[PDB]
Design a protein around this ligand. Structure first.
Ligand SMILES: [Mg+2]
Lengths: 713, 145, 183, 29, 23
């Protein structure tokens, strides 16, 4: 008897048991990315090498323009999207949706007028030109704001995002560019410090247009890796506005729908299938194509997206039309920083050395392996002396997702070619599409699918024939969600590891229980699975915080005191689990904090000690993260972690909050300096303390002397 | 296997006690090599194993190996290439880029089926223990239980 | 062929002698590998969700809860059985518990033998599985190119034991499914 | 200085190891 | 002082003392 797991499909549908087919209990694949980045550049230019090749006068790079190029003659990926066809699709989309473009443009403009510079602090690691590295959004934003002050660009102080972006645009004109760079001196200790460095205009333009690269990590389902990219602060605001516009457009579209989260995907799939089946003519046939585009962002041109932005904002003030046209402009002239170089070794001497990318071609190509040899040979035309490669055509992943979805839905909305006997419609979301064709026979449905494929070729959209298949309507998959006979089986979302969030005991317990309850509500988690999730989370929580039941035989520093508390406390079911108490969480009470849940069973002294109003394990400045959302209570288990123009802003804002406890909660309001308000409130506080006897005469005299030293007497 | 009352102890102490119970295997200091794979040094691996046993059985409480120099070469750590500045690499014509290593193309093996058969069978010993959860009052939590 | 193995002694497990060898091997890891190994316990969750769904379906077909009926049966429902394997070319059935253990072991092996090859093979073979499901239900599936899909699947079968054994099992199950289609 | 180390071959010197490791290694001769 | 043994592939050298000539 030889066990065969696949035999479980003989008695169960593949969709029902599809979860087990997904490997999501192992290690996701993890990585130098220089080879992968060079491969991405080579592939992107290969799909566009039949277009127009010229030299960018602004930067001196080599530019390739596949748009409006020769029509494809084979089945290989093609970037030769015709502008007239894209405009046709967008005009059709506008016709079917009266005033959607105008409404989206107006909403985007109105939201842009209110957005402030600090909005750029949200996101992931951004490219920092001052250091040519990857640094958090806040770090890059404040570094850019500081370096703009040295260049007489004071738009950040104006508040709103429009003046800051105006100064970003202006910075591209300054003949030079001064900034603060980290310099390491050997004093032997490597001490870094700020130095006033300068770069001429062209280098600054290259840095602003440059896109840092790395190898995408933890991308399950792919054998080989790819290149993920991050942009700088110069393109962040414009990209934000264009993405807001695209989202405004795509939330109304029924093919894409408002980007769905949770179980709304099931509703979208069911609605699409039911609508198409109802539309099916009497005696006809409806076929669903489960499609999948791979590397479809390498055939999408920023020039096409510039055209879409221009078409979408047909009736808008020229200022907003120009503002929305800057992200495509900066993406069409982008520069791809190439990894960290290749490593060459000699084993007869047991030596190794990394070759920095600026020095890729300083070595004869005969000293590279064959694949790298060919890669570099093909990359030479687009190689920049400074260690980067110009990448005009194509688009990196994650930059224009809503806009690309809008383009895909525009392709879907054609619905027919040549008044043939078939109607097609589908769903599109972020590189993943599903099509449905209704006709009078299978042959006509295949004709419709072929017509859709050819039409998508005209917009730069390529669909993988190896990854796409077709069947009768009623069974398909979309966004890793399998629909079959009205039953949807989303089983590609890996349940997040049910372990402590690592913030603190009370907050971690609240977060874990809320996460389990949210999983039950949204991801269709069943009762038993949720209970086992609770058990696993409690095990991890006890392991992390060394908080096992007082009656257990575990030993440790904290466990000795927990064991003491086990017997010193009479009411045993009222203890928090962090104090060796028994867990009492079940499905019904996942939404009530255990501090409240055990309040009635707590001993008279245990609640007082734990809920002692003045206890040392709580600080006001540690409350910033209480909101971000979990519901909890304040107590001895509410401590914070030790800390592992930065300090300037940090201490200034800390003092601002300390003087006024309201600034932490709600934004303060005023039309004056913070220094004068601080001085006035400190004067009031000193007077109140002097009146109430909380301060002595000498202390108030010193306070007034200090205030005069500030100059507010 | 070492039967215990359930008290949780440090892994070093657990290993020391388990080895102490099986003293014949712990004190075996004359190896009988059955098959050395292709390149592994039998002497290196055996001396490393003996160092492991001595470290586990020592009266100390630290688990660090007591050689730290033989183990440097036994594990192959010492056989690592030395980085050099890029200039010498550029000038050295014998420093090339290592060709990619392609995984071997193998055929089906009869041990994977045996492992699948054996691992999915009930045993006399269970190592899975989970915490408790609060009582169940609603019928839904009863069916989940 | 990767293990240097010595003979360190012998044991009496139950009064019968058994040689005790010591398998020695030099391996490498990464902190991410250790972390994701710490999260092998989620296999348990993966192995229950599945079963829960099954029971749910049965509980939907007939009102009362079918867990007892599914596992060991009841007055009006015989215990559920699943085709687990084969011997001498004849498929063998087993209880719900046996299928449960098979699913759990499958998840555990996916964890143990998990790497780029396994992820690629599973992702690419999912398409063939769905095509076979469409064939079974008489949905008249179509393929725009089949050799491309086959090459994409087969490029991941190099040296991973689980991928190769899974390919063997897939071929065996596909032969059984073809025979079932004939009848 | 760093260049002169490798240009003159001074860097291509065999590492000395404790006699126990060398004896245990059959490749050394 | 003894003799000297060497591994060229590993680029290692060791000195075997006279007492350890036959080990
Ligand atoms: Mg798909």
């Amino acid at each position: 008897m030889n066990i065969n797991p696949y035999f479980l499909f003989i008695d169960v549908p593949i969709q029902a048991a599809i979860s087990t087919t997904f490997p999501y209990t192992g290690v996701p694949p993890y990585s130098t990315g220089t080879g992968y980045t060079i491969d991405t550049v080579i592939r992107t230019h290969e799909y566009s090498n039949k277009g127009k090749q010229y030299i960018s006068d602004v930067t001196g790079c080599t530019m390739v323009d596949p748009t409006n190029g020769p029509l494809p003659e084979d089945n290989e990926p093609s970037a030769y999207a015709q502008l007239d066809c894209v405009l046709e699709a967008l005009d059709r989309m506008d016709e079917e949706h009266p005033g959607l473009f105008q409404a989206a443009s107006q909403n985007a403009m109105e939201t842009l007028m209110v957005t402030t510079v600090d909005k750029l602090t949200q996101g992931r690691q951004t490219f920092d030109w001052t250091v040519c590295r990857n640094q958090p959004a806040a770090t890059a934003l404040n570094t850019t704001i500081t370096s703009f002050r040295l260049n007489d660009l004071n738009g950040a102080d104006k508040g709103g995002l429009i003046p800051f972006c105006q100064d970003i645009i202006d910075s591209l004109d300054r003949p030079e560019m001064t900034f603060f760079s980290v310099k390491n001196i050997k004093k032997i200790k490597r001490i870094p410090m700020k130095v006033k460095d300068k770069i001429t205009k062209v280098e600054y333009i290259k840095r602003a247009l440059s896109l840092n690269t790395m190898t995408k990590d933890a991308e399950r389902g792919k054998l080989k890796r790819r290149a993920i990219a991050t942009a700088g602060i110069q393109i962040r605001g414009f990209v934000l506005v264009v993405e807001n516009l695209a989202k405004n457009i795509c939330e109304n579209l029924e093919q894409s729908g408002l980007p769905v989260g949770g179980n709304e995907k099931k509703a979208k799939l069911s609605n699409a299938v039911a609508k198409m089946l109802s539309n099916c003519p009497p005696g006809g046939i409806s076929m669903t194509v489960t499609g999948d585009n791979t590397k479809w962002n390498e055939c999408l041109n920023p020039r096409i997206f510039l055209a879409m932005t221009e078409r979408i904002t047909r009736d808008s003030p020229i200022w907003f039309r120009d503002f929305c046209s800057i992200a495509p402009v900066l993406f069409s002239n982008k520069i791809a920083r190439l990894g960290k170089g290749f490593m060459i070794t000699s084993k007869t001497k047991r030596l190794k050395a990394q070759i920095p990318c600026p020095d890729l071609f300083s070595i004869p190509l005969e000293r590279y392996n064959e694949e790298t040899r060919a890669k570099l040979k093909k990359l030479k035309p687009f190689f920049n002396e400074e260690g980067t490669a110009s990448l005009s055509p194509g688009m990196m992943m994650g930059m224009f997702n809503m806009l690309s979805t809008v383009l895909g839905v525009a392709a879907l909305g054609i619905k027919n070619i040549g008044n043939k006997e078939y109607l097609w419609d589908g769903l599109q979301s972020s590189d993943d599409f599903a099509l449905f064709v209704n006709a009078k026979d299978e042959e006509t449905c295949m004709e419709g699918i072929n017509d859709f494929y050819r039409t998508c070729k005209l917009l730069g959209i390529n669909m993988s024939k190896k990854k796409s298949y077709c069947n009768e309507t009623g069974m398909f998959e979309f966004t890793s969600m399998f629909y079959r006979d009205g039953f949807v089986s989303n089983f590609a979302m890996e349940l997040p590891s049910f372990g402590v969030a690592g913030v603190n005991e009370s907050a971690d317990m609240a977060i874990g229980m809320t996460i389990i309850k949210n999983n039950m509500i949204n991801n269709g988690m069943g009762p038993a699975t949720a209970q086992t999730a609770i058990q696993l989370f409690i095990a991890d929580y006890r392991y992390t915080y060394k908080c096992h039941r007082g009656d257990s035989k575990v030993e440790g520093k904290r466990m000795k005191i927990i064991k003491e508390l086990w017997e010193n406390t009479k009411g045993r079911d009222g203890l928090l689990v962090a104090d060796g108490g028994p867990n009492i969480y079940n499905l019904r009470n996942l939404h009530i904090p255990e501090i409240v849940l055990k309040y009635n069973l707590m001993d008279p002294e245990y609640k007082g000690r734990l809920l002692h109003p003045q206890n040392p394990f709580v600080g006001h400045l540690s409350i910033e993260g209480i909101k971000e959302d979990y519901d909890a209570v304040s107590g001895t288990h509410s401590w914070r972690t030790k800390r592992n123009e930065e300090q300037c802003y940090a201490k200034c804002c800390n003092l601002f909050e300390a003087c006024f406890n309201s600034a932490s909660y709600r934004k303060p309001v005023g039309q004056h300096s913070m220094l004068e308000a601080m001085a006035h409130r400190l004067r009031m506080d000193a007077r109140l303390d002097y009146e109430s006897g909380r301060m002595s005469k000498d202390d108030f005299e010193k306070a007034m002397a200090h205030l005069g030293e500030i100059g507010y007497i | 296997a070492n039967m215990t009352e359930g008290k949780s102890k440090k892994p070093k102490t657990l290993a020391k006690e388990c080895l102490e119970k099986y003293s014949t295997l712990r004190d075996q200091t004359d190896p009988i090599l059955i098959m050395k794979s292709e390149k592994a040094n039998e002497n290196f691996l055996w001396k490393l194993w003996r160092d492991c046993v001595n470290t586990i059985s020592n009266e100390e409480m630290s688990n660090e190996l007591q050689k730290t120099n033989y183990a440097k070469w036994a594990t192959g750590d010492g056989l690592t290439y030395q980085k050099i500045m890029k200039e010498v690499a550029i000038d050295d014509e014998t420093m090339c880029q290592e060709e990619p290593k392609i995984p071997n193309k193998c055929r089906v093996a009869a041990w994977v089926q045996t492992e699948m058969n054996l691992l999915s069978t009930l045993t006399s010993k269970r190592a899975l223990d989970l915490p408790e959860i609060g009582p169940d009052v609603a019928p839904v939590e009863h069916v989940g239980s | 062929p990767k293990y240097t193995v010595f003979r360190i002694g012998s044991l009496f497990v139950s009064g019968r002698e058994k040689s005790v060898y010591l398998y020695c091997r030099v391996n490498g890891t990464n902190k991410i590998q250790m972390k994701w190994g710490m999260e092998a316990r989620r296999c348990l969750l993966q192995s229950m969700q599945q079963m829960e769904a099954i029971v749910e379906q049965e509980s939907s077909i007939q009102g009362y809860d079918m867990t007892k009926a599914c596992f060991k049966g009841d007055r009006v429902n015989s215990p559920k059985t699943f085709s687990i394997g084969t011997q001498e070319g004849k498929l063998v059935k087993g209880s719900f518990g046996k299928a449960l253990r098979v699913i759990f072991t499958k998840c555990l092996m996916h964890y143990v033998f998990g790497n780029a090859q396994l992820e690629g093979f599973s992702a690419e073979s999912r398409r063939l599985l769905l095509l076979i499901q469409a064939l079974k239900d008489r949905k008249g599936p179509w393929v725009f190119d089949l050799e491309g899909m086959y090459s994409g699947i087969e490029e991941c079968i190099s040296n991973n034991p689980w991928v190769i054994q899974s390919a063997y099992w897939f071929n065996e199950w596909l032969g059984f499914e073809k025979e079932g289609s004939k009848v």
